Symmetry: C2
């Protein structure tokens, strides 16, 4: 909605999404937090360790409705409110070079589905 004009300083976004084939080595249970970001977007797969205003692994979850600061993997910080938790899964995957990482369900695609235009 905001007008962008000659001479203005702005921030530009540059995507570099990568995709890799991998093998599922394990499926485990994981506690996730549900938070409403100040922008109105709602996340149900926030890691407890990504709340940086309260050390939730040491002190337990925030109170429901509590204002929290959430870190995104690139270090950007966001205001949100904590609204509860759920238990879901993490998927341990192995790459072609033998390296491994644990992934959330949202970041996994079967070999049959279209990969997103996010790249």
């Amino acid at each position: 909605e905001k007008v962008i004009s000659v001479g203005q300083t702005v921030i530009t976004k540059h995507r570099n999404t990568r995709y890799y084939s991998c093998r599922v080595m394990a499926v485990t249970s994981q506690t996730f937090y549900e938070v409403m970001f100040d922008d109105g977007s709602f996340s149900r797969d926030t890691f407890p360790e990504d709340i940086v205003s309260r050390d939730c692994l040491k002190l337990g979850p925030p109170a429901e409705g509590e204002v929290v600061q959430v870190k995104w993997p690139d270090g950007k910080l966001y205001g949100a409110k904590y609204f509860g938790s759920n238990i879901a899964h993490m998927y341990q995957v192995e790459f072609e070079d033998g390296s491994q990482i644990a992934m959330k369900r949202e970041d996994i695609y079967t070999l049959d589905e279209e990969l997103p235009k996010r790249v």
Copy 2:
């Protein structure tokens, strides 16, 4: 909805979105295509040169309703249908090292707005 199991080969997505401060050097007019992807998602800012099933810069736009193949910047190809065109703007921006690039409005953020969790 699909079940992911131990021993399965899957594809995993890894974001690496970067953000940079830059200066707007020019605002120009640009013809964009409007396409409906087979997945039901609708784009209004597709570049004519990103239709790869018809060379639209040489032969003009596809017919309305025509099946097209669309390339995404990472080379992934998608089926879609062409549904018309519009004229919008491109923003020529300059980075701190003096390099420049033309950007779509969707990829530009003012210094006041929150940057997205896409990173």
